[PDB]
Design a protein around this ligand. Structure first.
Ligand SMILES: Nc1nc2c(ncn2[C@@H]2O[C@H](COP(=O)(O)OP(=O)(O)OP(=O)(O)O)[C@@H](O)[C@H]2O)c(=O)[nH]1
Lengths: 1111, 49, 105, 169
RNA sequence: GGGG
DNA sequence: TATAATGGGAGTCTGATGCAGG
DNA sequence: CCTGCATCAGAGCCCAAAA
């Protein structure tokens, strides 16, 4: 069908590569494709250059190299291996005493490599590293809350690279310095820098009472060396103030370009703010034997000038996105790399003392264990390294562009308040105002705006078009927040004739504040409305019509859309759904021009102009982290002529290259018999019949056979006391055959384990003797099927020890994996949502004969209750339906861009053209207006919907332009007493499906210490009946019900055993006994040397252990 | 949870598979009183698969 | 109601030489309209064998007495040079809508 | 240093494997196999012994190890208690004793008394030939015979009251 | 990080 | 069981209450 | 006598919780 696009906005630049924030960050850190001599000092390179040379003997760093991966990406995922490259480093050993030089290339372990789409493979699982927002290093000045006329200057370096500093000015009048939460007079530190009373008086003095308050005579009564010793006694009480020891402490804390690192952004922000230029990233220097100041005096100078009200001095807003920067993958990994390198150096210095000061090379001197652990620690356990969200291609694309304020070096949950969670004015065009979690994390986790990119310093930049005179150039400038506030920025929709601003009054911003301005005053202009919102928000058509709280739900839920076998793109798109599939890397494109030689289910072979017969294998039914099927399908035919960049295969949840998160269904908006109540949804059985909303899902099962002190676990088809009916679908070896239907209780992999000293009790001995069957040496441990799961066995992997290429963790003979698939039809309790935030569970599936239908016999698909619209204020879904109605009959799909879209009149033109096909067909087919259509028209003119005094066709078209049609109830045949809104809507099936969530337990596993039921469905747990639930039972006064919850249904052991026996014998359950978790409480208080005594009414002790604990 | 308009105020819809687990001891006793299984132990073995 | 494809153990397979996956193949066979001329006939089994660079349609099923394929133009599988295909489709008479989990034929 | 204490000499051997493998990884640019370490360790060492040594060297892990970013989940909570009988099993053991005694008496108590002494309900009194000399009521070879007729009548009596078949699991 |  | 070796390395915000201090 | 000032103990529920 035809695709009609609305909107007048010409976007001068396309969206940037969307995963570039990941790819570019790590490529810059490793520089693997750069020749060593040409590397800039950044990332991995910078870490080596910082840690070396290592002093005593001197070990010096030459260069590093990265090898190729031992195994390819697919292979790593299979074998539970990390995708990584071997790292080597060339080191030269120098003897500071002798002259000796031994040089060798030492192996430092492996480093994980990033794939093409911006993710990692860590132990077989695909992972994402989330960027971290934090306060930029630099020098800031904030108002002191206590004294309304004074200020604090804070010098903050990069995280873990130095202390926080506070320069409060105390009530006594002297300027104080705060380091590691301890305070002293700042004048003392100034003298150590070699400052004299003259320098401070002549430099500053202009502020009469402030500069004199810093002056303290006792401090001046000593040369720079004595003042250094004096300060050290303040910071480290009890440590003897040896001159080399004091220098070492203060140097490492202040001047050392190893223990103190301002940022590269810190240097720029400091140089720019104080109007000085920094020679390095440290606050001071050690030069010609004494200390020479860099930062401290300019920072003191700015503070006094600010307190006095000198022009050009302002306080800094700490949530401004110019003073807040992003820490990307490379930077996070490099920080952990730097820690691991410094630890290895501890091993080097300590080994340069023990064992002979001569017979050592660099290869024996280096133990790489500290480095390997730090990198492995970061990737396998950091709280920024997350399990990839790959439910559908958009899930992972969004995951990679997220920004977290949490994690190692940032806010905690308990540690976080309003200023940080707010939407700052500088978020415009940089961080999406919509896409954030609802609940406790609101505002801490956000998403990168679509046109934003992170610069080399770590500040988020956004594009704007230059405007010279009144003419808008095509030159685009990416701006930081600090630089953006200088200019006057017009809105992207301001009218244009050609390249000229066509309005006499334009809508613009100056420092985020909205302002009306004449075309003479316009310096820049927005590139597009798209630049303000995240990628998910940009996928919501008619967004200009949706309340923000609901738009949020629309964004977040597209992440949760399950790939459907029949998946289709929405009939109303925003025009981004093409780009998302392409940047995600889910689909497949042609490298150069060529002709398709072969097309298969498994592969596509293309013959290019070059003559090379490139073969593209297709990924078929691979199981993602969330168990949705990632599978690619061929879109071309043998001999098809393709150009460069044309589609070859469609990925999951994509249709002919457009993002398909759901299906397009015909919807009626109307109550239906209370099956619509409070957001529930009623659907037509026609949807299951034609396999709409069916999705494939795969669950993975695994079992190990290991060596025990009692003998080997063996995976075998021979399992004690089981009938042949039970083993039928098992192969020779005890593994289920590929292509079998397995249901709950069925054996997947047979296994036997050797019986413990529980070697059968005499009760079992006599029973076994009666039947004349020896009690077997092994017991049945077979892997089976959990309650509620099962499907078709599609694959088996078996890995033993002593087979090529495989070695398991110690003690493990063999590992078997069984992949089981299921086709899931939509059912009652599965969850649906559209892009505007209407979400609900399927409560009823009616047979097609009950569904409301159009006069021409077509039944509707979904019935949504109108009560969900007005309080929610998400109207985009309404406009989406109307344009969807026209498209149903005209056979078209639309692109309506956000904020430059299809407007109401334009949709009306399209709706009228549809009516001709819905009606004109009928008038020609020899049918006139229906009797019931008149009855509804009667009711409609009482409503003011149609104008009185027109032919039925004239009135029906009037209703059709309001998006309403006559609807017949399939139960009665009578019309709905009014015209009903009907049209095509895009609705997705989300990841929350009852099959996954239904759970129940009679009795089951218990915890070790408490003897209470376990938690969670996978453990067959019991439900938690918590403090508030007990209150509920208490307020009702249901004491025996409550007592059951506290005893027989949990940790009362004598009672719960006895209660079960009663139910199976038909007796009533016994009165409960003492709960075991109370006995634990008693014994734990005894371990604290407290005597807890249960007493009777006579004040005599009562023994709740029934004699077992007393001698 | 799913809405159930047809229920009277004192009722709820309970999936049969959930009810079988929650009442399992009761179900075992009743299966012996009528006749689906010889005794309590065999009846439980039948519900496993 | 049922399909057996040679060298295929279950629905999620894929056939060398065939463009369509088995899921799509069964999806196309679900559109097949098969008329029984004899009112006494409740079940049959259509056979299809195809090879070479051909687009198999519903006509290519081997003709059986008292059964007429009302839509012989329906596309089934696209095969490529070297692509093969041998299947047996069981067609039944029944009422209403009976889902695959229900009949298990 | 270890929660599970190791003999001082054995700790020395483990540390040797560590150093050895660490050299081996530095020359090979990748992790060594068990076999590569067994060669480097010399005679007496095969790959099997290197693995068993590593199994012994494994240190235990805390039951209180956190799972997840929320600070509200412990590893021990996912561990069932395998020692204490479950309600089903405890119920089963009571029911088994009840059918077992209600079964030796439906032949004769005395031929049940001879057989019951030869194994013991809550005691476990299985010798073989000597001890059985005293009080059953007969001399000594005879008890082996009534053991068979008790066991034999039990076997016939079992096919009717086949309720004991299901206790074989 | 995700559901209400 | 024996050259001599002699002092360490490292990280929010609220309200209530019991304490050395103009 | 009274007031700064620190040290301490608080910060919602249930479910997945992908180790
Ligand atoms: N305590 C608590 N409740 C939650 C949480 N998450 C979701 N909820 C529930 O979410 C529900 C929100 O329901 P709403 O749909 O906003 O109810 P409403 O007032 O009718 O709002 P509208 O439906 O838009 O009219 C509440 O009833 C909460 O019990 C949570 O994290 N904590």
């Amino acid at each position: 069908m035809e695709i009609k696009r609305f909107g007048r906005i010409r976007e001068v630049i396309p969206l940037p590569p969307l995963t570039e924030i990941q790819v570019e960050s790590y490529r810059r850190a490793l520089q693997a494709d750069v020749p060593p001599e040409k590397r800039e000092n950044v990332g991995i390179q910078a870490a080596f250059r910082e840690t070396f040379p290592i002093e005593e003997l001197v070990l010096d760093f030459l260069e590093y190299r990265l090898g190729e991966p031992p195994f390819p990406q697919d292979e790593c995922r299979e074998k539970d291996l990390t995708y990584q490259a071997p790292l080597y480093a060339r080191l030269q050993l120098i003897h500071k005493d002798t002259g000796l030089i031994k040089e060798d290339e030492v192996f430092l372990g492996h480093i994980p490599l990033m794939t093409e789409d911006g993710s990692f493979i860590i132990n077989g699982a695909d992972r994402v590293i989330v960027s971290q927002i934090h306060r930029s290093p630099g020098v800031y000045f904030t108002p002191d809350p206590a004294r309304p006329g004074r200020y604090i200057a804070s010098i903050i370096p990069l995280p873990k690279r130095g202390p926080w500093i506070d320069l409060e000015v105390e009530p006594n009048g002297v300027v104080s310095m705060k380091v590691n939460k301890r305070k002293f007079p700042l004048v003392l530190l100034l003298r150590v820098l070699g400052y004299d009373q003259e320098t401070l008086a002549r430099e500053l003095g202009a502020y009469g009472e402030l500069v004199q308050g810093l002056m303290d005579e006792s401090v001046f009564a000593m040369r720079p060396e004595e003042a250094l010793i004096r300060l050290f006694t303040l910071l480290r009480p009890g440590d003897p103030p040896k001159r080399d020891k004091a220098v070492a402490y203060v140097y490492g804390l202040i001047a050392d370009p190893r223990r103190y690192d301002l940022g590269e952004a810190g240097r720029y922000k400091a140089e720019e703010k104080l109007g000085i230029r920094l020679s390095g990233r440290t606050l001071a220097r050690f030069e010609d034997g004494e200390f020479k100041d860099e930062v401290f005096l300019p920072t003191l100078r700015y503070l006094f000038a600010l307190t006095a009200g000198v022009p050009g001095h302002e306080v800094d807003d700490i949530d401004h996105l110019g003073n807040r920067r992003i820490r990307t993958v490379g930077e996070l990994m490099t920080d952990q790399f730097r820690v691991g390198l410094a630890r290895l150096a501890r091993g080097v210095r300590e080994r340069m003392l023990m064992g002979s000061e001569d017979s050592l090379t660099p290869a024996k001197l280096v133990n790489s264990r500290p480095l390997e652990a730090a990198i492995r620690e970061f990737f396998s356990r950091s709280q920024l390294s997350q399990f990839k969200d790959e439910t559908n291609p958009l899930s992972s694309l969004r995951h990679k562009r997220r920004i977290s304020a949490l994690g190692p070096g940032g806010l905690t949950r308990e540690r976080a308040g309003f200023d940080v969670r707010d939407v700052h004015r500088t978020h415009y065009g940089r961080i999406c105002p919509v896409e954030t979690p609802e609940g406790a994390n609101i505002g801490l986790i956000t998403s990168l705006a679509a046109y934003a990119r992170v610069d080399e310093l770590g500040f988020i930049r956004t594009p704007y078009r230059r405007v010279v005179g009144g003419v808008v150039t095509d030159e685009v400038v990416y701006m930081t927040a600090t630089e953006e506030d200088r200019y006057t920025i017009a809105q992207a929709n301001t009218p244009l004739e050609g390249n000229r601003i066509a309005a006499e009054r334009v809508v613009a911003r100056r420092k985020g504040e909205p302002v009306i301005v004449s075309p003479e005053e316009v310096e820049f202009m927005d590139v597009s409305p798209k630049q303000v919102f995240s990628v998910n928000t940009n996928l919501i058509p008619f967004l200009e019509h949706d309340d923000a709280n609901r738009a949020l739900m629309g964004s977040n839920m597209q992440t949760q859309a399950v790939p459907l076998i029949r998946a289709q793109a929405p009939v109303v798109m925003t025009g981004l759904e093409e780009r998302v599939v392409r940047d995600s890397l889910a689909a497949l494109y042609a490298e150069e021009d060529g002709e398709v030689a072969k097309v298969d289910g498994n592969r596509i072979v293309v013959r290019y102009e070059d003559g090379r017969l490139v073969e593209y294998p297709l990924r078929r039914f691979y199981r993602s982290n969330q168990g949705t099927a990632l599978d690619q399908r061929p879109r071309v035919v043998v001999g098809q002529r393709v150009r460069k960049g044309d589609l070859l295969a469609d990925g999951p949840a994509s249709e002919n290259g457009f993002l398909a998160l759901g299906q397009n269904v015909l919807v009626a908006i109307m109550p239906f018999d209370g099956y619509n109540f409070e957001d529930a949804i009623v659907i037509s059985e026609e949807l299951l019949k034609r396999d709409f909303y069916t999705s494939i899902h795969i669950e993975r099962y695994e079992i190990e056979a290991r060596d025990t002190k009692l003998g080997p676990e063996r995976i075998t088809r021979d399992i004690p006391h089981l009938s042949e009916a039970a083993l039928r679908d098992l192969d020779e070896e005890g593994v289920v055959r590929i292509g079998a239907e397995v249901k709950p209780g069925d054996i997947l992999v047979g296994r036997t384990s050797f019986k413990g000293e529980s070697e059968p009790t005499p009760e079992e001995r006599l029973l076994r003797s009666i039947f004349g069957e020896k009690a077997r040496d092994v017991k049945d441990t077979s892997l089976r099927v959990p309650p509620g799961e099962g499907g078709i066995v599609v694959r088996t992997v078996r890995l033993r020890r002593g087979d090529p290429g495989v070695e398991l963790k110690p003690g493990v003979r063999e590992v078997v994996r069984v992949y089981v698939a299921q086709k899931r039809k939509l059912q009652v309790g599965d969850k649906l949502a559209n892009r505007h935030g209407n979400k609900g569970v399927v409560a009823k599936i009616l047979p097609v004969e009950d569904m409301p239908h159009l006069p021409d016999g077509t039944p509707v698909d979904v019935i949504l209750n109108p009560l969900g619209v007005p309080s929610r204020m998400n109207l985009g879904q309404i406009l989406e339906t109307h344009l969807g109605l026209a498209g149903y009959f005209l056979g078209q799909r639309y692109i309506s861009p956000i904020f430059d879209g299809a407007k109401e009149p334009e949709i009306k033109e399209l709706l009228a053209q549809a009516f001709e096909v819905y009606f004109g067909k009928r008038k020609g087919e020899g049918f006139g207006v229906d009797k019931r259509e008149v009855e509804v028209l009667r009711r409609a003119e009482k409503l003011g919907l149609v104008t009185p005094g027109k032919t039925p066709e004239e009135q029906l078209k009037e209703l059709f332009l309001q998006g309403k049609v006559v609807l017949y109830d399939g139960r009665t045949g009578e019309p709905i007493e009014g015209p009903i809104v009907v049209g095509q809507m895009f609705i997705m099936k989300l990841y929350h499906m009852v099959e996954d969530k239904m759970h129940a337990r009679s009795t089951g596993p218990y915890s070790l210490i408490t003897q209470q039921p376990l938690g969670g469905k996978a453990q067959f747990g019991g439900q938690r009946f918590g403090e508030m639930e007990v209150w509920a039972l208490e307020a009702y006064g249901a004491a025996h019900t409550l007592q059951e919850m506290l005893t027989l249904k949990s940790d009362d052991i004598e009672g719960r055993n006895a209660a079960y026996e009663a139910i199976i014998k038909g007796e009533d359950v016994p009165e409960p006994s003492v709960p075991e978790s109370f006995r634990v409480l008693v014994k734990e208080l005894q371990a604290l040397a407290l005597d807890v005594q249960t007493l009777d009414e006579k004040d005599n002790p009562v023994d709740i252990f029934e004699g077992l604990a007393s001698k | 949870i799913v809405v159930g308009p047809q229920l009277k105020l004192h009722q709820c819809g309970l999936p049969k598979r959930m009810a079988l687990e929650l009442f399992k001891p009761f179900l075992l006793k009743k299966m012996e009183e009528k006749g689906i299984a010889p005794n309590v132990k065999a009846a439980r073995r039948m519900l496993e698969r | 109601t049922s399909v057996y494809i040679e060298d295929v153990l279950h629905e999620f397979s894929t056939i060398p030489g065939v463009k369509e996956d088995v899921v799509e193949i069964i999806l196309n066979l679900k559109e097949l309209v098969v008329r029984f001329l004899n009112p006494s006939l409740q079940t049959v089994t259509l056979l299809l064998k195809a090879e070479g660079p051909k687009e198999v349609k519903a006509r290519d099923f081997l003709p059986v007495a008292d059964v007429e394929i009302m839509n012989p133009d329906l596309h089934i599988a696209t095969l490529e040079e070297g692509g093969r295909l041998n299947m047996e489709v069981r067609v039944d008479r029944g009422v209403g809508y009976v889902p695959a989990e229900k009949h298990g034929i | 240093a270890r929660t599970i204490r190791i003999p001082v000499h054995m700790v020395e051997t483990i540390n040797k494997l560590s150093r050895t493998a660490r050299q081996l990884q530095q020359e090979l640019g990748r992790e060594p196999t068990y076999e590569e370490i067994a060669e480097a360790m010399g005679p007496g060492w095969d790959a099997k012994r290197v693995e068993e040594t590593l199994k012994i060297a494994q240190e235990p892990v805390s039951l209180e190890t956190p799972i997840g970013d929320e600070k509200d989940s412990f590893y021990g909570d996912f561990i069932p208690d395998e020692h204490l009988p479950s309600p089903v099993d405890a119920a089963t053991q009571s029911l088994l004793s009840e059918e077992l005694e209600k079964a030796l008496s439906k032949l004769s108590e005395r031929e049940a008394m001879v057989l019951k002494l030869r194994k013991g309900l809550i005691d476990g009194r299985e010798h073989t030939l000597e001890e059985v000399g005293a009080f059953f009521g007969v001399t000594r070879e005879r008890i082996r015979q009534i053991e068979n007729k008790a066991l034999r009548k039990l076997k016939y009596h079992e096919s009717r009251t086949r309720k004991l078949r299901d206790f074989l699991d």
